[PDB]
Every structure is written in structure tokens, then in C-alpha cells.
């Protein structure tokens, strides 16, 4: 009926708004940024028991010092992640230093609007919660199909993102310790699941300030965090 | 460059009979051979034959290009192809790489059909490495051993001739020519096409 790049009477692009509709469904994920580092997590929406659950992974690494958490159309998300890590390694080749997270999300947003001729064919329909550490300090960032990127102390994406933002607003406080951040993330995540929290039912990653290195928590660390989790 | 894989071809005409012949050598580094079966004659149609002399890879590549074009022509037209059409198309192909050419000096030997019954007119012609066609109407020779063959044919050609005498004539001309060239020889084959039949024979040459 209309083209991809047709403005609405209200000045909004139809395809961009429909892409915003697509990210409203998906796996819930939560991010927290504190002085000692950054934390990301996902509800790990497991399919039937015949799936391995190792291949189905929601927390990938753009680089050694950057994590991510996806939402929406996932194949489009892997395409964006692949382009992001390629450009970050291009920075690492052209410049010795590690790329800042702001530049990475700016490049990701630049690719996301490539369908508007100003090649791709439509918006990507992906929301990312990128997190990392650099010389400026630890931070996390939000991305959406409209190209605007906003920088957060704590956020969430996916299906139950509204309640996750409400609980993060109620509970998050500045000058927080990293252990406080981990238990806060698991409390919010547990409150917004459908199924009971467990070890295989959740995945976590973090990038410490000292290490400046991506590190996905294994089953032992997750169980240790769950055992000291209030209820 | 033609000393590398030296070769020779020959073709005569007669009374309702035509002959084509070649040497079976394949050279390498001029003065050492590697095979005694490399036929320069290639059948292409029921009454058209072509003799390619020069570099072996160019001989083979030109054979597949012409076979592609020929079999396309019989399949589309659904009828047998003429010698003149093949000669003109060969001249166009050799000219199409006027710069960086195929290092091959081919010939064409066959029969010309004049329908009305039908009469088989002999046809012979020769080419440079670009397609410098020249109708000859008698003996046609091409290769490194061309001069010796030109010397032999005028002494030995007897105008129109029987197919047996044509075979003796072309065989003696080729054998006397190849004996006087060091980089050309190692056996021979003589194809004598007629409308009724074709006789293919190999000669007890100085292959050593």
C-alpha cells in the first residue's frame, strides 16, 4: 500500500513504529551499571527439553570488553552483533586502544537506519542492551530501531520490561556495591519470570572494572548468587 | 614459439576424392618429444575436417570452441553444415583475438555439396594465425614443415587423381617432408574421405 520510508501524518515513520511493536515481545533481559562494573541478564526462555540450551544463547560479546542482551527478531540481532564486532576489531586494528562503547552503539544505530537511502531493505526490528568498560568508566547503553540511543544506569527489554523498569526504579540506588547489583538483578529477574528461578533457567555476564574483560557466569557462580539471594 | 610443439598438416584434392594428413608428434622444449599419438586432424562434421597445427593448448582450445559453435549450428538449423560457413566462422574466431592470438595455423578440408541428385565438389583452404583465408583449389600445406611440403607437392601433384594414387601422392609428400624436419614427424595418419566412405590409414614412417 505504501513504501518502507513513508512518513505518517504525525511525522513518524510507519516501519519504524511497527519495528517498535516487534520488540515488545521477546525474552526479558535486565541490565545494571555500577562503579565496579556492569551486569546483564536474561530470562533464558527455554524451549522444549530436546534443545541443548548451549546453542540458544542470549548474551554474546561484541569484543573482549563489551557484552550485549538482545530482544526482538533474533536473526536480525545476530546480523547487527556481527557487524558490531567486525567494526570494533577494525578499530582495534586501526587504533591500538579498545573502542569506547558509545562509538559502538553509534555504529550499530548507523547500520540500523541503513534501509533509508540517505544495502538493506527494512528496519532491523531489534533492541539491544549493550554494556562494557572503558577508560571513561563502566556504562551500559540502550538501542532501538528508531536509531536514538540513550544511556542508562539500569534498564530492561523484552516482554516484561515495564515491570522490570518499575522494580529497578524502586530498588536501584547509587554508590552501590557489585554484589548488591547482582542480587538486585536476580531479584528483579525472578519477580518478572513466569517459571521459578534456577541455574539453567538464567544466564549472567559481567565486565569488571579491574579485569576490563567479558566473563559469563557459569553454573557454580549462578548457584552461589542464588543461595545468598533474599526471599 | 612454433618450434615448441612442432607439427605439420597437409591436404590434397582429386576426382571425387579428398585427402588430409598430419604428423603425430607432440614436442616439449623443442628437441624432446613426449607422445606419438597427438593427431592434428579432428573430425567436425560428416563431410568437413579441420587440421590445426601450432601450440598444442591452442589447438585443443580452438577445437572445443569450434565444436561448440558447430554443434550449436547443426542443432538450431537441424541440418548439416557447409564447409564455407565453417571456414568463415573459423576466420572470425581467429580474428576475434587479433591481439594476444591463438598460436595456431589451421587448415580446412572437406566437400562442397551442390544440390539439384547431388555433386560433391572438393574444397581446401588455409589460414594464418589471424584468419588470412586463401582459396587454393589444389594441395594445401601449413606448419613449420610447410616449405618442404610446398616443394614436394608440385613435383608430385598430378591434378585430378584416383583416391589410391592420391593416397600414395600425399603419403610420399608428407613422409619426404617430415624426414627433412627434425622437430616434426613421429608417425603419420592419412584420412581419405569420399562420399561413399572414408579410409583412415597410418604410415610406417621414420618414427625415431
Amino acid at each position: 500500500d505504501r513504501g518502507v520510508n513513508t512518513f505518517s501524518p504525525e511525522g513518524r515513520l510507519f516501519q519504524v513504529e511497527y519495528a517498535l511493536g516487534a520488540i515488545k515481545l521477546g525474552s526479558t533481559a535486565v541490565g545494571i551499571c555500577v562503579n565496579d562494573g556492569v551486569i546483564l541478564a536474561s530470562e533464558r526462555r527455554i524451549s522444549s527439553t530436546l534443545i541443548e540450551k548451549d546453542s540458544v544463547e542470549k548474551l554474546l560479546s561484541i569484543d573482549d570488553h563489551i557484552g550485549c542482551a538482545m530482544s526482538g527478531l533474533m536473526a536480525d540481532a545476530r546480523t547487527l552483533i556481527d557487524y558490531a564486532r567486525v567494526e570494533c576489531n577494525h578499530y582495534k586494528f586501526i587504533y591500538n586502544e579498545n573502542i569506547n562503547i558509545k562509538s559502538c552503539v553509534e555504529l550499530i544505530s548507523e547500520l540500523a537506519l541503513d534501509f533509508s537511502n540517505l544495502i538493506m531493505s527494512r528496519p532491523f526490528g531489534v533492541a539491544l542492551l549493550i554494556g562494557g568498560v572503558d577508560k571513561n568508566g563502566p556504562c551500559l547503553w540502550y538501542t532501538e530501531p528508531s536509531g536514538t540511543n540513550t544511556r542508562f544506569s539500569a534498564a530492561s527489554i523484552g516482554s516484561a520490561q515495564e515491570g522490570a523498569e518499575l522494580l529497578l526504579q524502586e530498588n536501584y540506588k547509587k554508590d552501590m556495591t557489585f554484589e548488591q547489583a547482582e542480587i538486585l538483578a536476580l531479584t528483579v529477574l525472578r519477580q518478572v519470570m513466569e517459571d521459578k528461578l534456577s541455574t539453567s533457567n538464567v544466564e549472567i555476564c559481567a565486565i569488571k572494572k579491574s579485569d576490563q574483560t567479558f566473563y559469563k557466569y557459569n553454573t557454580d557462580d549462578i548457584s552461589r548468587i542464588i543461595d545468598v539471594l533474599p526471599s | 614459439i612454433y618450434n615448441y610443439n612442432g607439427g605439420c598438416v597437409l591436404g590434397m584434392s582429386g576426382s571425387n576424392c579428398v585427402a588430409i594428413a598430419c604428423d603425430l608428434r607432440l614436442g616439449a622444449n623443442t628437441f624432446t618429444t613426449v607422445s606419438t599419438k597427438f593427431s592434428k586432424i579432428f573430425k567436425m562434421n560428416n563431410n568437413v575436417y579441420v587440421g590445426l597445427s601450432g601450440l598444442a593448448t591452442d589447438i585443443q582450445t580452438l577445437y572445443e570452441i569450434l565444436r561448440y559453435r558447430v554443434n550449436l549450428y547443426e542443432v538450431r538449423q537441424d541440418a548439416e553444415m557447409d564447409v564455407e560457413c565453417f571456414a568463415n566462422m573459423l576466420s572470425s574466431i581467429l580474428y576475434s583475438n587479433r591481439f594476444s592470438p591463438y598460436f595456431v595455423n589451421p587448415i580446412v578440408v572437406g566437400f562442397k555439396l551442390k544440390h539439384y541428385k547431388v555433386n560433391y565438389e572438393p574444397y581446401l583452404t588455409a589460414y594464418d594465425l589471424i584468419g588470412a583465408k586463401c582459396e587454393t583449389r589444389d594441395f594445401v600445406v601449413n606448419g613449420v614443415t610447410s616449405e618442404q611440403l610446398f616443394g614436394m607437392c608440385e613435383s608430385l601433384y598430378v591434378k585430378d587423381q584416383d583416391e589410391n594414387g592420391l593416397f600414395e601422392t600425399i603419403s610420399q609428400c608428407l613422409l619426404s617432408a617430415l624426414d627433412r624436419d627434425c622437430i616434426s614427424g613421429w608417425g603419420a595418419e592419412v584420412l581419405v574421405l569420399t562420399p561413399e566412405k572414408i579410409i583412415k590409414k597410418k604410415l610406417k614412417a621414420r618414427m625415431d
Binding site: - | 538450431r76 538449423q77 564455407e84
Partner: protein
């Protein structure tokens, strides 16, 4: 932006090609006869006002020394098809050094018409060529359509009232017909088709007399034939 304006409808039928045949059926008729020792292409031109000269407009053309052509439809389509057919005959003669076969030319022009039916951003050609010629394999007569399909005929008619002209030509035709009798049957067929009165400058004829060049008859020769 390039997309096929021509497309399959339910039950197919290629509606644009059907409209092209409707254009051909309304256009001024043409016909051709294959004889024992010759082939004819003939067509009537509309009864002209005195300002037109027939020495400028020509529905009869020659592609080569031995090959003629006549059409029924849009003139510009016929002009571009004729020019490209001349180029095809020329490139074949450049390659193989001979006058082009009728079958190869018919196949190439049929493929071009199909390409214009299939290609996006275009419409089919609104005419129906009628190629005649002589070569080694006897005489031929062919008929191109907007669909890009060719049919081998021995005698055929195109245009308005083509079914009735086909029936009349079937009534008066023999395989061993002489060339003069074929010309007379062409004149009688177009006379029955026109529903009027004919003369020189109202009809045009082309013919190939044996293994000789394709010839277009002047008005004097046609006036001799009409008597």
C-alpha cells in the same frame, strides 16, 4: 522499478498478448503464398488521399537479397523489428559469410518478441510479421505473432476477416501451383477481403522468382496483372 507489466491472469491467457492480437486483427491485412517455384508476400494499403505517395510508405521490405517481409499492425514496431532483423542477417553473414537462413532469422526475431513480452517496463509488439525467403533448402514462409511463436505455412492471411480469407485461399490453392496463378489468387483473395474497388497504388506485392533476388512489383506490373 523494472517489473513485468505483462503477467499471468487466472486461467493465464496472457491478456496483453490477446490485446496485441486484437490490434493485429483490426489492422490492414497482409498475406503470402508459397508456390512450386516462388513465394509471395502481398498486402493491401488503405485507399489513400491524394497527398500520400506510396513511394514513401512501404509495408513490403527486404532484409537480404532473397528475404522479404510484410506486417499488419503498428508501423514503428515494424520499423525497429526490420532494422534489428537486418542487423541479425548482417552479423550472421559476417560470421558465416553467406545469406542468412529463413529459419534462424525467424527464431531470433521470435526470441526478441518473447524477450519484450517477458522483460519488465515494456509491452508486447502490436504486429504480426510475415517473413518469406529462399535458401538452399527450398522456399519458406513464416508468420511471427506478438507471443513470439512462429508457424510454418504454405499459404496464409493476416488481419481483418482473416478467417474468411484463409477459407477462400484454402478453396483456391494447390501445392504445385505456378507463381502467376499464386499472384492471381492473391489478387482475388484481397479483392474479396477489401469489399470495394482496387487499382494500382491501393495494393502492394513482393515476390521471389526462383533462385533470384527478392523483387517488389511496381504499379505498372500490378496494373498488367490486374487486367
Amino acid at each position: 522499478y523494472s517489473f513485468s507489466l505483462t503477467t499471468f491472469s487466472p486461467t493465464g491467457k496472457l491478456v496483453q498478448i490477446e490485446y496485441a492480437l486484437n490490434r493485429v486483427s483490426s489492422s490492414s491485412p497482409a498475406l503470402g503464398i508459397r508456390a512450386k517455384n516462388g513465394v509471395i508476400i502481398a498486402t493491401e494499403k488503405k485507399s489513400p488521399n491524394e497527398l500520400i505517395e506510396e513511394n514513401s510508405i512501404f509495408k513490403i521490405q527486404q532484409i537480404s537479397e532473397h528475404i522479404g517481409i510484410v506486417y499488419a499492425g503498428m508501423p514503428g514496431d515494424f520499423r525497429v523489428l526490420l532494422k534489428r532483423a537486418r542487423k541479425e542477417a548482417i552479423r550472421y553473414s559476417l560470421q558465416y559469410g553467406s545469406e542468412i537462413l529463413v529459419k534462424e532469422l525467424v527464431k531470433i526475431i521470435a526470441s526478441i518478441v518473447q524477450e519484450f513480452t517477458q522483460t519488465g517496463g515494456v509491452r508486447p509488439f502490436g504486429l504480426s510479421l510475415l517473413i518469406c525467403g529462399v535458401d538452399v533448402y527450398g522456399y519458406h514462409l513464416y508468420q511471427i505473432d506478438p507471443s513470439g511463436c512462429y508457424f510454418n505455412w504454405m499459404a496464409t492471411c493476416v488481419g481483418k476477416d482473416y478467417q474468411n480469407n484463409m477459407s477462400f485461399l484454402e478453396k483456391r490453392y494447390n501445392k504445385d501451383i505456378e507463381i502467376e496463378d499464386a499472384i492471381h489468387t492473391a489478387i482475388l483473395t484481397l479483392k474479396e477481403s477489401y469489399e470495394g474497388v482496387l487499382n494500382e497504388k491501393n495494393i502492394e506485392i513482393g515476390v521471389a522468382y526462383d533462385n533470384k533476388p527478392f523483387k517488389i512489383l511496381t504499379q505498372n506490373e500490378i496494373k498488367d496483372y490486374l487486367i
